[PDB]
Amino acid sequence: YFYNGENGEIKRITYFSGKSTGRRMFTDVAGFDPDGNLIISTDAMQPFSSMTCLYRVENDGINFVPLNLGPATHILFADGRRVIGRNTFELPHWKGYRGGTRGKIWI
Amino acid sequence: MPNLLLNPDIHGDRIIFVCCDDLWEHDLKSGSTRKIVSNLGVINNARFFPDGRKIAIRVMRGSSLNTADLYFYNGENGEIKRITYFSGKSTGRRMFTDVAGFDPDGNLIISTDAMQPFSSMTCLYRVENDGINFVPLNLGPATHILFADGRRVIGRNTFELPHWKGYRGGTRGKIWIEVNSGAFKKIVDMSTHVSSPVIVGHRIYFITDIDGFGQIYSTDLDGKDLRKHTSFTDYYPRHLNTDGRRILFSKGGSIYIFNPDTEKIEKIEIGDLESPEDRIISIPSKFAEDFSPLDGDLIAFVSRGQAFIQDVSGTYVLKVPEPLRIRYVRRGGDTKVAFIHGTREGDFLGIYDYRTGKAEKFEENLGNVFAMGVDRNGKFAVVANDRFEIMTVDLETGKPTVIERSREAMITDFTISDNSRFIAYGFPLKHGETDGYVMQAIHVYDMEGRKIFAATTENSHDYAPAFDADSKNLYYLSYRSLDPSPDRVVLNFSFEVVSKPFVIPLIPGSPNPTKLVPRSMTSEAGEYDLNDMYKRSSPINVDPGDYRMIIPLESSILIYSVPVHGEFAAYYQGAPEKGVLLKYDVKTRKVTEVKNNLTDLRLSADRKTVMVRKDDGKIYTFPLEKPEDERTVETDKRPLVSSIHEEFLQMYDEAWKLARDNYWNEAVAKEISERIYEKYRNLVPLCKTRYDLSNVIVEMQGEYRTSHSYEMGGTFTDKDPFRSGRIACDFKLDGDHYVVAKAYAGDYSNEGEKSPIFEYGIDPTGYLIEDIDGETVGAGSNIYRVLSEKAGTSARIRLSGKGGDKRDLMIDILDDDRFIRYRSWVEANRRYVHERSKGTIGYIHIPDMGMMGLNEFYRLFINESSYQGLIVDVRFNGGGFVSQLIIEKLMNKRIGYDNPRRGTLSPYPTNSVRGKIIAITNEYAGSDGDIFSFSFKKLGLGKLIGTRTWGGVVGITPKRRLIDGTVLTQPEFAFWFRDAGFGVENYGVDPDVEIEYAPHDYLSGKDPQIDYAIDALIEELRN
C-alpha cells in the first residue's frame, strides 16, 4: 500500500496476494531507482517462492516492469551503479547462520 | 479535498474532534494534528476531563449504530478502556447514553436510559471506579449537567436537533438551575430549541435559532440578560464545549473557536487529515433485492444500485453495464432483459441483452416507477408510478402510453395475458372524496379496441389478478368472504380469514372451469366479450383464509397462504410475514402443502420455474413440476464493487429528491428544495464515511423545518453491536460485594416480566452476589462486564441472603430487560394509584400507539375500567396510529346493566369506563401521542394533566430505500385538526392543568403528575 502524508490518502498498489511466512516475508519493497520509482521484490508471478524477482512499480500498480536481475531482497543505486542484495533479509530464527543461502551483495 | 470535522472539545491549546468516525487531537500552538483513537467503531462525542488528561468517549456499534457505550482514553500511556456495558440503545436523533458533565470532584457524570423503562428517561449517574459502580443523582432525565458556584445547572433535552430546524414543540431544550441549596428553578425556556449549553465565567452559553438561524447566545445564571454573539448564515453551529476560558464548536465541517472576552470567532486551520481507499468491496446479498427468474434457468437481481445476470450457483455472473441506480430488472426475452434506471430527474426504462452486449436506454421519463413487467412476447412493458398511473412502454420505440390513472394510490398489482392482449390490474378507488376506506376493483385493458373493462364491482378489495395459459379465464383474490373471528381477550371480532379466490371466464357462456362441468354438457366456442364480466364472476371452492397469490395451472391451482399471526415483531423488529405455498387439485378438490417457511415468492414467465425466499433469509429456486428439487441461490461468490464518492453523490441526490417529492406541502417544497440543494451538496465530497454522509443529509432534512424527517437503517460500521448482560436487577456496590438493590417484576404470571431469578422461588432483593460462572465479582471485578460476557446463556450465580442463606442457581442472562423494567413500573404505578385512592381509581398506561400500545392498553383496561375513576397515563407515548381505536373505547358511555339470576352485574357497553377519566401526558408523547392528547381534550373525555407534548404530527410512510439500505423518512401526511388546522405541528398539546416535574421532585422521589391526577380525581369523586 501507498500512504501519502500530504492528504492522508491510503491506497493498495499490489493485488498479487503474495504468499508469506514468518521467515520469508516476501513481496516487499526492494528499493528506489534514480528516478524515484519504487522497485519491489515479489515471487507472485514466479514458479518458486525463493524467486523474489525485482519489479519497477508504475502508475500506482497499473503495470510492473521486470528488471530481470534475478532474485533479490534489496536493490541500491550508487553512482549510477546497481547494488544487489541477495537473501539479505533478517534471520532472527537462526543466529550464526553460515549456510549457502546467507546474505550476499553484488555490484 | 479536505475532511468533515465535527463535535469538538477544548482544553487550553489542545483541541480534540471527530474525523472519519475516529478521534483526533490538534495543538493550537504547534499546529499539528494526530489521530489518538481509532477502530473502536463510530465516535460522535469526546469530552476532556478536568485535568485534561483522560477523555470520556462515546462510541456506536452495530450495522446501523443501534448500540452505544462509553470508553476512557488516557493520553498519558495511550491506554483505552471500556467503562459501560449497558449497550444503550440509540438512533440518529436520540444518541443516548453519553457524557453529561463533570462534578466538582472531577468525576464523570453520564446520562443513560440503560436501566430505565423509557428511552427518553436519560437519567444522570456518577461513574465510579472506571465503571464498577454507578451512583444515581436522582435529578430526573437530563442531557447536560454543569456546576456553577456549587449550584447544579441542568440541561433537559439539550442535544442538537439538526433534523428539525426551528423546532418549537414541548420537548425543546430547557435549562434549570439550583437555588435553595436543594431546589431548582427553570431559567431558560425560550420559544425555540436550546442546545449544547456551557458556562464561561458566570454566563451560560448555548445555541438556538429563535431568530431563524443557529447562533450562539448566553445569559446569566438567571436566564436573564439575553445576548446574541454570532451571526452565522452558512451552516448551523453545533456541539458547544469549553474549558472555562474559550468556547469550541463545529460548523459546515470546520472547527471554530469563540473567545467570550473578545467576542471574536476564528476558524482553526487543520487541512487534509485522511482519505481512505475510495473503491470498496461489499457483500451482494446484504444489499440485494428484486431477485427474479430468467430464461434458461438463469437469475437476475439488483443490489446496491447494480444489476446482475447469473446462474443459480452465482459462479457465472454478469453485471449489467449501466450507471448508478437500477431499480428493477425484468425478463424481456431469451437473452434480453428490461430494467428501470433511476437518475436525479426520474426513472427510465432500459433494455439489455446479456448475449450480444447491446444495451439501449430510453429517454422518456416515466416518473417514479414502483412496479414493472414485460409481456411474454417481449414487445411492450407495463409500468406503475407514484403519479398513480399505469402505462405500456413500447420496448422498441420507448414511447409510454398511459392507460388509466387512480387518484388514491399506486396501480402496482397487475398482470398481462399470455397472448399479450389483456392487462388486468387492481384499481384503487373511493366512493367519496373524504371517504375513510379505499376500495380496489380489478380492471381489464384490451390492447385491441383500447378500452378498459370492469372485472369486479367496487365494494371491497380485489387483487392478485392472474390469467391462465390459454388466456380464457381471469382468476383473482378478494377479501369479500366476510366472517368474524372472535377476540380471545377483549369483547371484539375482526375479519381474519375472509380471503377467497374467484374466476371470470373471458368468453360469455363458458362456465367456471374449477366447477368441472362436463364439456359435453356445455356449449362454449363463443368469442371474447369483456362486457358485464363482473356478473359472470364465480368463486372457486377453496376454504377462506388469507391468500396473497393465485396461480392457475392445467389441473391445479397454486395459492400463497399466510396463517393468522401477531403483528408485534413485524411492526417493530420488522420481521417478515410467514406464508406457505398451497396446491388445489381441480379434480380431487383436495388441498396440500407444496412448500412452507416462505416470506416471498416469484414465478417465471413459463410458469415452470419458482423462486422463493424463506424465513432463513435465503433465496431458493425449484421447478413447479418437481418442487422436491430446489437449489440455493448464491450471490456472494463475486464481490460487489463500488466507489464511495460516486455512491455518496448518488445517495445525497436521492435523499434530497425524496424530501422534496414527498413533503406534505407541494408549494413549499419547490422553494425549500432548490434553496438548500447546492449548499449541502458541496459537503458531500468532504464525506469519507457513512456517518459523515449522514451528518450532511440530516442537516439538509432539517431545512424543511418539520417533524418526522428521519434516517434509519444503512451500514455505518462493520463492528458488532455492543452486548449487555441483564437479569432485571439493580446493583449497588457496597463495601467489596455487589448487592441486589432492586429486583424488577410486573405481572409474575405473565411472560418476560420479572428477573429470571424469580423462577427459582426467591426474591433476589437484598441478596449479595458472590460470583458468576465461578468468577468472583465485587470491588475488583466489574459485574456488568461479566454479565455482558454471558449475555444470551445461563450462568451459575452464587447468592447470599440474610443469615446463611446460600444459593447456587443457573440464571438466564438476558440480552435486554427494558420490557421487564417497563411492566414493573406500570404495575408499581397501578399499586400506588389503588392504595392512595383508597381503591377507587384505576390506572392504565399507553407506552405508544402501535402494537405494543394495543397490548398494554387492553392488558389493564380489562381490569381497571370499572373503578369510580380512571387515569389514562400517556406519558412517553411514542405514537403510532391506533389512538383513534383507544379514544373509541374511552368514548363509550355506560348506559345500562345486565341482571343475571346468578352472578354479578354486567355493564353495557362492556368496554365502557365506569366513571371519571383523567389523562396524564408529558413532553415525551408525540405523533399519534400528540393526536391522542389533543383529541382527549377536544372530545372532553376528561382533564389533561402534565406538560405540553412533543408537537410533531406530519405522518410518514416510506416506500423507497437507499442503495445502502438506508431508510429515509419524509413528512408526507399532514394532520389537520378541526378548529386548529395544522397548529399542533411544531407546538404540541397544552394540558388543561400544567404540572412540571422539577429536578427536586425527583430528589424527593415523588411523581407530582400522577399525584395531581389522583388527588384531582378524588375531588371529582365527591359528588
Ligand SMILES: N=C(N)NCCC[C@H](NC(=O)C(=O)[C@@H](CC1CCCCC1)NC(=O)OCc1ccccc1)C(=O)N[C@@H](CCC(=O)O)C(=O)N[C@@H](CC1CCCCC1)C(=O)O
Ligand atoms: N410503522 C412503524 N413500524 N413505525 C412508525 C411509527 C413512527 C412514529 N410516529 C407517530 O406515532 C406519529 O404519531 C404518527 C402519526 C400521524 C400523523 C398524521 C397521519 C398519520 C399518522 N404516525 C406515523 O408516522 O405512522 C403511520 C401513518 C402514516 C401515513 C398515514 C396513516 C398512518 C414515531 O416514530 N414517533 C416518534 C415520537 C417521539 C415523541 O413522542 O416525541 C419517535 O421518535 N419514537 C421513538 C423512535 C422511533 C422512530 C421510528 C420508528 C419507531 C420508533 C422514540 O425515540 O421515542
